[PDB]
């Protein structure tokens, strides 16, 4: 006989476990009505604008308890490494500055993603995408955020959209008369650490699955600012369904799923394998960015049904900029998830490097120290990331020289958020180093980029280049963009390619800028043991 079984059967489908605050007076935007014997809700679409604006504003200044608890856990655990505690302390202090509501917690204020669930009898007028986008436009336009969306004018010619649009708007049709939401301000770095694997039945035994987890977790590296929320999805009805599921799992959206399967193929959370993932993460030694125990905050493992011929697998993280907000509109008005507004309650030996000298003198000083040495940088950084590197390579391919500004100073891979009025800099932390790896040997061979500054482990070609050319790669802490802006960055100037927005070349003056020597000029790599 026919028996319908929904794949996802959360015991808390409306997220009653979350605390919400009502937007004051927002009941003026809704009206409960009764049509053809059923309860319906008229919603002024302006409510969607109000809600998206507040959500994509608040989420940049506050965090969830389970995120903050993880940093405090990394500080208080006796088994944490010194680097574990240093990174976690820095990120918590960063969260305290972001809670001042001026600087966002990360310079990468993310892609705006909306998961919406509009009830059959929730009536908005139907222009939901436009009104949601206007609220997002408002949040990024009128706050000290960043325009991160790159439009393709043709296959290769690109420009910044200048407003952080378009958003990803996934609006679903569901029963009832309410409107439920998950808003995600998704950073590019953690979005890049969402992986799809095509596997087989040969994986589905304890030994093979454990080895698989050990292998794949290492490929995450430190490039998305751990401690991670690690999500793992085994199975799925299609690649895109698996990847949607691992995204939502990383947002703890499926925490209330059943924990056992059944003959109808329902999804379930697997706490036993979450514990195994956490054991792999801890024993890896990768740590909170620079070696230790706190590679991961927590783990979510969801087992899904599969076509007999198929076994898609998804792996994804939520990064230090852990930014999602639940919300709903009902007959009483607009409700938005309450984040922690007082992160301070969760709070329970370096080499001074003067950059104000010839770059060869800085290289000689750095050459005296092993990888893993904590440094503090004082002086000028030249800022350049993906597009500027591509333009400079193209210039050199046409016979033009490597520009002078790639030869005078360490290269900081970064793109700033907008500068608050009266501030020296907006949030201005690093971007992922690995994306620039293909340029390092080329640029060093042409007399520049000897010292680079960013975050994440890099490929072997960069280790070889630094040894061949006497270069260095310095790893900044990943994520603490607001405290770096408040305490370290003293002057910001646009140097070249202003049309690229945040991806322009910048010249900045910094003081007390912390970093680790990750790659030296001798073939050493402080990630060589944990990530290889």
CA-nearest of 59, 261, 245 to 143 is: 59
Residues 172-201 that bind a second copy (CB under 8 A): 172-176, 186-189, 191-196, 198, 200-201
The Cα–Cα gap between 143 and 52 comes to 13
Q: Distance between alpha carbon 346 and the CA centroid of its chain, in Å? A: 21
Residues 87-106 that bind ligand SF4 (CB under 6 A): 106
Tell me which stretch binds a second copy (CB under 8 A): 204-212, 332-340, 484-492, 514-522.
Answer: 204-212
Smallest distance from a second copy to CB 201, Å: 4
320 near ligand SF4, judged by CB under 6 A? yes
User: What's the first-to-final CA gap in the chain, in angstroms?
Assistant: 53
Which residue in 319, 384, 406, 519 binds ligand SF4 (CB under 6 A)?
319
The Cα–Cα gap between 28 and 320 comes to 37
List the single partner that 42 binds among ligand SF4, a second copy, none, CB under 5 to 8 Å by kind. a second copy
Q: How many residues does the chain have?
A: 532
Looking at the Cβ atoms of 343 and 448, the one nearer to a second copy is 448
Looking at the Cβ atoms of 24 and 36, the one nearer to a second copy is 36
List the single partner that 424 binds among a second copy, ligand SF4, none, CB under 5 to 8 Å by kind. none
**DSSP per residue over 438-472, as a string?**
HHHHHHHHTT---EEEEBS---HHHHHHHHHHT-E
Smallest distance from a second copy to CB 268, Å: 8
Contacts with 76 (C-beta within 8 Å, 6 or more apart), sequence order:
348
276 near ligand SF4, judged by CB under 6 A? no
List the single partner that 429 binds among ligand SF4, a second copy, none, CB under 5 to 8 Å by kind. ligand SF4
221 near ligand SF4, judged by CB under 6 A? no
HSE-CB of 197 using CA atoms within 13 angstroms: 20
List the single partner that 467 binds among a second copy, ligand SF4, none, CB under 5 to 8 Å by kind. none
Pairing of strands 38-43, 30-35: antiparallel
295, 283 Cβ separation under 8 angstroms: no
User: For ligand SF4, which residue has the nearest CB?
Assistant: 187
Largest CA distance in the chain: 81
402 near ligand SF4, judged by CB under 6 A? no
3-state secondary structure 386-428: HHHHHHHHHHHHCCCCCCHHHCCCCEECECCCCCCCCCCCCCC
List the single partner that 478 binds among a second copy, ligand SF4, none, CB under 5 to 8 Å by kind. ligand SF4
**Residue 327 labeled ligand binder:** no
**Residue 319 labeled ligand binder:** yes
**DSSP per residue over 158-173, as a string?**
EEE-SS-PPPEEEEEE
Which residue in 226, 410, 478, 501 binds ligand SF4 (CB under 6 A)?
478
Sheet holding 122-123, edge to edge: 30-35, 38-43, 122-123
Tell me the two tokens of residue 514. 């912390």
Tell me which stretch binds a second copy (CB under 8 A): 85-93, 95-103, 106-114, 288-296.
Answer: 106-114
Residues 290-319 that bind a second copy (CB under 8 A): 303-310, 312, 316
Binding mask 409-448 for ligand SF4 (x = CB under 6 A): --------------------x-------------------
Looking at the Cβ atoms of 224 and 355, the one nearer to ligand SF4 is 224
45 near a second copy, judged by CB under 8 A? no
CA-nearest of 465, 461, 409, 454 to 431 is: 454
Binding mask 46-85 for a second copy (x = CB under 8 A): ----------------------------------------
The Cα–Cα gap between 167 and 148 comes to 11
23, 55 Cβ separation under 8 angstroms: no
Residue ranges at the known binding site for (S)-malate: 107-108, 146, 189, 192-198, 385, 431-435, 455
Binding residues vs ligand SF4 (CB under 6 A): 106, 108, 187-190, 224-225, 319-321, 429, 478-479
Residue ranges at the known binding site: 106-108, 146, 189, 192-198, 225, 319, 385, 431-435, 455
């Amino acid at each position: 006989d026919f028996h319908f079984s929904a794949i996802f059967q959360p015991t808390d489908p409306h997220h009653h476990q979350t605390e919400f605050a009502k937007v004051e007076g927002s009941e003026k935007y809704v009206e409960e009505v009764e049509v053809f014997g059923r309860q319906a809700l008229k919603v002024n679409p302006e409510a969607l604008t109000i809600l998206a604006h507040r959500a994509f504003s608040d989420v940049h200044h506050f965090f969830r308890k389970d995120h903050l608890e993880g940093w405090r856990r990394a500080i208080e655990d006796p088994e944490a490494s010194d680097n574990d505690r240093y990174v976690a302390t820095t990120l918590l202090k960063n969260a305290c500055i972001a809670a001042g509501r001026v600087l966002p917690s990360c310079q990468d204020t993310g892609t705006a993603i909306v998961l919406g669930k509009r009830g059959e009898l929730c009536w908005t007028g139907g222009e939901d995408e436009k009104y949601l986008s206007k609220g997002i436009w408002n949040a990024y336009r009128y706050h000290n955020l960043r325009y991160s969306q790159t439009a393709a004018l043709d296959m290769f010619k690109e420009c910044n959209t200048g407003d952080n649009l378009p958003a990803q708007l996934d609006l679903l049709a569901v029963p009832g008369s309410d409107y439920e939401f998950l808003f995600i301000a998704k950073g590019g770095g953690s979005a890049n650490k969402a992986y799809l694997y095509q596997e087989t039945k040969a994986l589905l035994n304890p030994k093979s699955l454990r080895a698989f987890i050990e292998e794949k977790l290492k490929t995450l590296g430190t490039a998305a600012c751990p401690p991670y929320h690690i999500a793992l999805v085994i199975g799925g009805t299609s690649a895109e369904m698996t990847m949607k599921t691992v995204k939502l799992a990383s947002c703890r959206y499926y925490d209330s799923l059943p924990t056992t399967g059944d003959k109808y193929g329902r999804a379930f959370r697997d706490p036993e394998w979450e514990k195994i993932v956490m054991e792999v993460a801890q024993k890896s030694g990768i740590g909170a960015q620079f070696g230790g125990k706190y590679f991961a905050h927590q783990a979510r493992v969801i087992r899904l049904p599969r076509h007999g011929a198929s076994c898609p697998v998804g792996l994804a993280v939520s990064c230090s900029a852990d930014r999602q907000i639940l919300a709903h509109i009902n007959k009483s008005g607009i409700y938005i998830e309450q984040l922690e507004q007082n992160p301070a309650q969760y709070l329970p030996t370096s080499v001074k490097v003067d950059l104000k000298r010839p770059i060869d003198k800085v290289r000689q000083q750095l050459s005296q120290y092993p990888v893993g040495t904590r440094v503090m940088l004082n002086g000028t950084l030249i800022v350049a990331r993906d597009i500027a590197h591509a333009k400079i390579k193209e210039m050199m391919d046409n016979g033009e020289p490597l520009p002078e500004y790639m030869k005078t100073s360490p290269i900081y891979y970064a793109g700033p958020a907008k500068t608050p009025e009266g501030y020296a800099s907006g949030s201005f932390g690093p971007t992922t180093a690995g994306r620039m790896d293909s340029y390092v040997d080329l640029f060093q061979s042409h007399g520049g980029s000897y010292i680079t500054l960013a975050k994440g482990n890099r490929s072997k070609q960069v280790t070889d280049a630094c040894k061949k050319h006497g270069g260095f790669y310095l790893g900044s802490i990943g994520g603490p963009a607001a405290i770096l802006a408040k305490d370290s960055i003293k002057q910001v100037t646009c140097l070249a390619f202003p049309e690229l927005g945040m991806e322009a070349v910048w010249k900045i003056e910094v003081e007390d800028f912390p970093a680790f020597i990750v790659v030296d000029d001798k073939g050493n790599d402080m990630y060589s043991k944990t990530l290889a």
